[PDB]
Amino acid sequence: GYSDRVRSITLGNSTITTQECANVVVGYGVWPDYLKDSEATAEDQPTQPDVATCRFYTLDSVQWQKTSPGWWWKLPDALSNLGLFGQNMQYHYLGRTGYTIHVQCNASKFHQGCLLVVCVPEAEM
Amino acid sequence: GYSDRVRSITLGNSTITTQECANVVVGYGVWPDYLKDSEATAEDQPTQPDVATCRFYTLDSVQWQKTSPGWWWKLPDALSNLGLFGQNMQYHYLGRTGYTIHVQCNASKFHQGCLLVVCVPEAEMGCATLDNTPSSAELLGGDAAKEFAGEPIASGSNKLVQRVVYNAGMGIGVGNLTIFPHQWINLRTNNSATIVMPYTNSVPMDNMFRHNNITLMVIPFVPLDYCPGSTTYVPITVTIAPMCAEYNGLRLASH
Amino acid sequence: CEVPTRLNSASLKQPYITQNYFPVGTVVEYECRPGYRREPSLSPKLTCLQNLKWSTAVEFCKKKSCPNPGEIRNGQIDVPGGILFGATISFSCNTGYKLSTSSFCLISGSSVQWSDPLPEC
Amino acid sequence: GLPTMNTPGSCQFLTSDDFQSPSAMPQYDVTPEMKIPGEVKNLMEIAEVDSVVPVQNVGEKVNSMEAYQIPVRSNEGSGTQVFGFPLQPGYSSVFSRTLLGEILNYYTHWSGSIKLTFMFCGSAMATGKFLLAYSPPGAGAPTKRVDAMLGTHVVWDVGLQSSCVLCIPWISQTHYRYVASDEYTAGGFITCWYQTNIVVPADAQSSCYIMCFVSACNDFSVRLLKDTPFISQNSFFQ
Amino acid sequence: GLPTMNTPGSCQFLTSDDFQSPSAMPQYDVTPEMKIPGEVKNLMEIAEVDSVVPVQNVGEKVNSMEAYQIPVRSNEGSGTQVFGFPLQPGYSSVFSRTLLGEILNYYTHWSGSIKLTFMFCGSAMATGKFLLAYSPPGAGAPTKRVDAMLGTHVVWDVGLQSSCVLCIPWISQTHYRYVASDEYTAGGFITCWYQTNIVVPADAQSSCYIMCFVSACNDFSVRLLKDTPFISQNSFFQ
Amino acid sequence: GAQVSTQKTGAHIHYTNINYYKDAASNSATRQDFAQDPGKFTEPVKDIMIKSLPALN
Amino acid sequence: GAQVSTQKTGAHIHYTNINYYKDAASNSATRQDFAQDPGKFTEPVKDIMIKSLPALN
Amino acid sequence: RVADTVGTGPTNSEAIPALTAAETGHTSQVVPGDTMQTRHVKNYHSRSESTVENFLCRSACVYFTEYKNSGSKRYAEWVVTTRQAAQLRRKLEFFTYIRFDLELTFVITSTQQPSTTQNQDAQILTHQIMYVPPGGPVPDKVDSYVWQTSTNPSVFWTEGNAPPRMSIPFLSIGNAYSNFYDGWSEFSRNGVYGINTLNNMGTLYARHVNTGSTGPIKSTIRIYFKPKHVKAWIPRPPRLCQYEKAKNVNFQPSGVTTTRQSITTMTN
Ligand SMILES: CCCCCCCCCCCCCCCC(=O)O
């Protein structure tokens, strides 16, 4: 048989497993894909590494304290210096990618709390 | 109509044109390609950039003088720090690519000379001292060209490479090198020489930092000569384009 | 039984060295000779069996490791034989600098150290 | 008299030869075979079963069971290292005495994938997440989680299923790797890091242990009979 | 007991023999072959590629590249000689170390035609014409152009195509010629002469060089394995 | 009454065998029996365990 | 299971071969593989070059 | 069979078979019938002795060492390498990558040494040759337990019989042997440089199984290598200079050829 609280994700040479997960939110109902010929504007041929660029990168950790307000991350900036992704976007002038975000917190049955994990497009401050 | 002295080559976002060229030498008759499923050994999926990696990179120029012995270049080492190619081979453990070499020299109808342009696979070299082995700095020159020597290098307590031009540092015969895919630049006939080399090795993939597969050797067989009044500075330029390059084993960058 | 088996790594403990009569069921203990370090898994004891033959003996000690050689400025260190007790490293210099030439890992006190210090070049 | 000619290699005793020879007991009647459970046909059948890996073989820990326990405890920090060792089943002291290592030490070449199974042996109220990474050679052992994340890794979430399997693939240029220590046939490095922090409720031990099992994959293979270094003898027994 | 009889030549070790012998490593699995560019099936494939001929091997010229350059310059005269050497690929110092010569020195008999390719390496404004002649033996080396014209010659005109090929045919009574020096199997003489004079414009160098390549023809063949004289040794290496 | 069988050759040419003695214990060794069944040692459990499903559910 | 092949005789009478071992590395040497292809070393160029035509035209 | 010549006649055409450009590097495929008049003669010659096999398929001594039945040197050892001698090394170095099976043959000869022991009546000596693959227990002494040769291959020969011979398959972790290597043992371009890094063929030992006589005797074993089933790739120029070491290609510089009187000399 199955449960629905277990989910594995495989990308590149990396894998992510989960034993207690909710469903998976998919953007605005759209799955990321490549650019079509009837919607492109630049004329030279693009490069698609597809293995090294498309893999799970793990940023640092942050301690959650009894009085923590919250944290924010800019994704094009967060991965700018990490892996081939950073080298690719460095040499190139134009780029196009979709981001899958996994945020994990570990606790017991005697700990309580609640986090909102949200992706804001164009978060001008 | 057509002539056959004009040839254009297009790779990535780069193009090379020629007005006076000989034919194009194609390795051992084999055109570079990718690795097949029935001949691979590593199991993870390879990356194939195919645009940025497969483009013409132009190394520095060297002046050809009336007394120049010759120069040599290790191709895995020459492009190690140049472009995405260097970044790709840096992070990855295994690599596989074929190299197309274009060497160009420019002169007049009153200048004379002759260069041999040859690609040697596995050009293992010797040391001035019979005991001991050559140092990495002496064997590998990156971002620059290494030069042969007209007279024998002295033997002492040293790790210098024997650079004699007549022994090509391998102790063999410079004339017999033609066994390797080669070409000539005769200043009265052709401005440039182009050689296309496939991937030659005994294993399917190899680490591109500890092993150099092929070495390019430009050797003047007839010295440059001209009469007073004509241009005295004649440079030689080398453009290398990687072809069908694939990499495996993504790991932390190696410096 | 006869004299216990000679082993390169260890040496017979006192006073068994000054003893020539070993009855059956006699245990002898060894100790690590310089530099040699004792191996925790193996136990250095041998027993005279009924056949008047000693028990199977294996090297109970291993060579001590000298410290890392370091990094000589403007110089190349050649390590052909590791950095264990009794090895020899070679000091060389790059083209354009003038330079001892070699150092030996030897027992100096209670541990092993290199002999010649790193030169200047 | 049929004229024949004797070639070199005559009246010689090559130990690995295959000839017929006259039977010393002619027309002997052997006991008929009977069905016996667990018949071995191939050595690889033995190499594909799990064997506990003595990871913590430090000091006197090899003289007890503590050599098998990986000590993970809750700490006021994140991204620290749990363990790390090289991928040398034949040579590394970690895998030398495992079933896989004991079978490899009889051969000279090995080729295939390695399966590592990690089982959490803590309380039922403890939780955690770990990063299990493998880095092929070329750059040294990763010293921090940022460098180990770039390799082949798995993020293990501790829950109802207490065991997670990390599969080290075959990323060697050579078809076969040497069992002995050769720097040409380098293997890589295997490491583990705290992904988050161990979460333990009050009145529950905060210091736990992990266990590790190793097994050969379906593609595994070995290719040259030799003699094990470990076996020894000073004189004929008894 | 099958009655047999042993003939002479029993229990002897002839180095060039072809017998079967028991395998020392039974049921060994070899690494599967892979496509490698440039496979050699025949030595003649190597002998049919060009190799630069050290013609000017006079004095210290062998210790540089000057051994490969043939020095042709404009002079106030006509009909002088440029070079000349005998047709002895195995024995003559000129062809001894060329690919063809290095392959011939492993054999004892040779038979076929020789291709000589001459490439002009002067200015693009220089011109000339040369007579390339071959004279079979019986009368000595021709001393002047009138005597060398009577042999097998080609008149080469220097122009856009800078290379001309002179094909020395097989005019030997014997089917195979000895690689070593034998006066019975004489080869002949190969010479070159100024047909006209080098014509050079003002402000253009009047001293040029020619280069020479040698290659085996399609009919070439060799017939007796032996040991090269050049290879030597005083004691085992290392 | 001879037996002709294939030899051990590399991937990517027949041999002949005759028995001279009458005891079946004097024949050569059986070097070419490549048959495996590791399901007795790996996976000796009673209820089948599919790989993708959870082990204990 | 024997192989009958022609021998090396002069121009201008069969031999029999049986394999006794089962390893394919113990057979005799392959002395009769007369196949050539010098087009990889001679003429490795990309555009074909007819003999009678000028090389550079 | 070699190609036969074709009969031709005179010619006054525009076809220029002789004129060509060697700048391309294309070897001209001209035949004598192109630059002269020729007869038609059938050619019956054959390139059967020029094949790679017939070239390298011959026995060649690659090493020999001496061991005694008393004193210090009681057994002999050799680290397998084909670079010890010059002839077979130079024949093999014609190619970059070679794949071949090996036919090993051993010749063992004994000799009585000068002494003063009276009443010498020897018996037949038997020799044991044990091969240890890399990583095995190497003999430390002549009466070592390792001589059991359970897994390890061994050959026993009694003096007066035919020399021992065995066949070894293509042993290599790669897809072909490498005569040349342009790299370092470490990924950092430091350490061993050259073909020595690739070498890893193990060690071969030899001993007297019995003392035989009360007097001294010295034996010498000779190793012979005959390549068979040979496949080769990428040819390279022959070694002009003389060899100096077995682990490296280091050499002393030498001239291209031998010097004559002038450029118009028909004699050496
Ligand atoms: C009973 C005695 C057995 C002896 C076995 C000896 C095996 C030697 C194998 C040598 C193979 C050829 C080595 C080539 C080395 C190279 O060119 O890289």
Q: Would you say residue B2 lies in a domain?
A: no
Amino acid of residue B134: P
Q: Does G54 touch chain E (CB under 8 A)?
A: yes
Closest CA to H69 of H128, H27, H137: H128
> Which residue of chain B comes nearest to C98, CA vs CA?
B158
Residue H79 Cα to ligand 1 midpoint, Å, equals 10
User: Tokens 């025949």 sit at which residue?
Assistant: E42
CA distances from B178 to A120, B100, C7, E99 (A): 65, 18, 60, 10
Chains that touch C (3 or more CB pairs under 8 A): B, D, H
Residue identifier of the C-alpha nearest atom 3 of ligand 1: H131
Could you give the dihedral angle defined by the CA atoms of residues A26, A27, A31 and A32, in that order, rounded to the nearest 10 degrees?
A: -130
Find the discontinuities in chain D where C to next N exceeds 2.5 angstroms and give the residue preceding each: none
Give the tokens for residue B208. 């591109």
Range of the domain at B221: 7-250
Q: Is the CB of residue H201 below 6 angstroms from any atom belonging to ligand 1? A: yes
Q: Do the strands E221-222 and E163-168 form a parallel or antiparallel pair, or are they unpaired? A: unpaired
Half-sphere exposure of H221 (CA within 13 A, CB side): 24
Does D142 sit within 8 Å of B41, measured CB to CB?
A: no
Q: Does C95 touch chain B (CB under 8 A)?
A: yes
Q: Is the CB of residue H223 below 6 angstroms from any atom belonging to ligand 1? A: no
Give the residue numbers in B contacting G (CB under 8 Å), as ranges. 3-5, 22-29, 179, 181, 189, 196
Contacts of G53 in chain B (CB under 8 A): none
Contacts of F57 in chain A (CB under 8 A): 1-3
Alpha-carbon distance D217 to D221, whole Å?
9
Range of the domain at H21: 1-268
Angle between helices B83-91 and A83-91 (to 10 degrees): 180
* Phi, then psi, of D2 in degrees rounded to 5: -85, 120
Burial of B28 (0-12, 13-18, 19+ CB in 10 A): buried
Does H163 sit within 8 Å of D14, measured CB to CB?
A: no
Alpha-carbon distance E150 to E65, whole Å?
34
Q: Is the CB of residue H129 below 6 angstroms from any atom belonging to ligand 1? A: yes
Closest CA to C29 of C9, C45, C42, C14: C45
Contacts of C98 (CB under 8 A, 6+ apart): C121
Q: Are E97 and E90 in contact (CB under 8 A)?
A: no
Q: B142: cis peptide before it, omega within 30°?
A: no
User: Tokens 């180095």 sit at which residue?
Assistant: E15
Q: Is the CB of residue H165 below 6 angstroms from any atom belonging to ligand 1? A: no
For residue C77, the SS3 value is strand
Contacts of D153 (CB under 8 A, 6+ apart): A13, A14, A15, A56, D131, D132, D133, D134
Indicate the residue of D23, D39, D42 with minimum beta-carbon distance to F21: D23
Alpha-carbon distance E172 to E170, whole Å?
6
* Phi, then psi, of D103 in degrees rounded to 5: -80, -35
Contacts of H168 in chain G (CB under 8 A): 25
Resolution in A for the shown PDB structure? 3.0
Range of the domain at F55: 1-57
What was the structure determination method?
Answer: cryo-EM
> Which residue of chain B comes nearest to A53, CA vs CA?
B47
Q: Does C79 touch chain H (CB under 8 A)?
A: yes
CA distances from D23 to D32, E107, E175, F22, F26 (A): 19, 53, 61, 9, 6
Atom of ligand 1 nearest to the CA of D16: 1
CA E73, E78, E80, E83 torsion: positive or negative? positive
Alpha-carbon distance H79 to H256, whole Å?
34
CA distances from D228 to D101, D221, H6, H30 (A): 11, 18, 68, 63
Does G47 sit within 8 Å of B24, measured CB to CB?
A: yes
Contacts of E131 (CB under 8 A, 6+ apart): E145, E148, E149, E153, E154, E155, E156, E192, E193, E194, E195
Q: Does F3 touch chain D (CB under 8 A)?
A: no
Bridge partner list, H229: none
Q: Does D4 touch chain C (CB under 8 A)?
A: no
Q: How many domains is chain E partitioned into structurally? A: 1
Residue H260 Cα to ligand 1 midpoint, Å, equals 44
Question: What is the separation of C-alpha A10 from the centre of its chain, rounded to a whole number of angstroms?
Answer: 13
Range of the domain at D63: 1-238
Q: Would you say residue B162 lies in a domain?
A: yes
Contacts of D63 in chain C (CB under 8 A): 40-41
Bridge partner list, C90: C78, C102
Contacts of H249 in chain E (CB under 8 A): none
Closest CA to A125 of A72, A67, A69, A60: A72
Q: Could you give the residue ranges of the DSSP H alpha helices within B73-193?
A: 75-78, 83-91, 136-139
Q: B76: cis peptide before it, omega within 30°?
A: no
Shortest distance, CA D172 to any CA of chain F (angstroms): 20
Q: Does D84 touch chain A (CB under 8 A)?
A: no
Closest CA to H215 of H20, H40, H68: H68
Contacts of E220 (CB under 8 A, 6+ apart): E44, E47, E48, E110, E111, E112, E113, H2
Q: Is the CB of residue H80 below 6 angstroms from any atom belonging to ligand 1? A: yes
Beta strands in H75-216 (DSSP E): 75-79, 95-112, 126-132, 154-158, 165-168, 177-178, 203-208
Q: Is the CB of residue H155 below 6 angstroms from any atom belonging to ligand 1? A: yes
Alpha-carbon distance F54 to F43, whole Å?
15
According to DSSP, residue H184 is labeled B
**Total Cβ atoms within 10 A of residue F8:** 19
CA distances from D179 to A109, B108, D139, D175, E24 (A): 48, 62, 22, 13, 21
Contacts of B171 in chain H (CB under 8 A): 239-241, 249, 251, 253-254
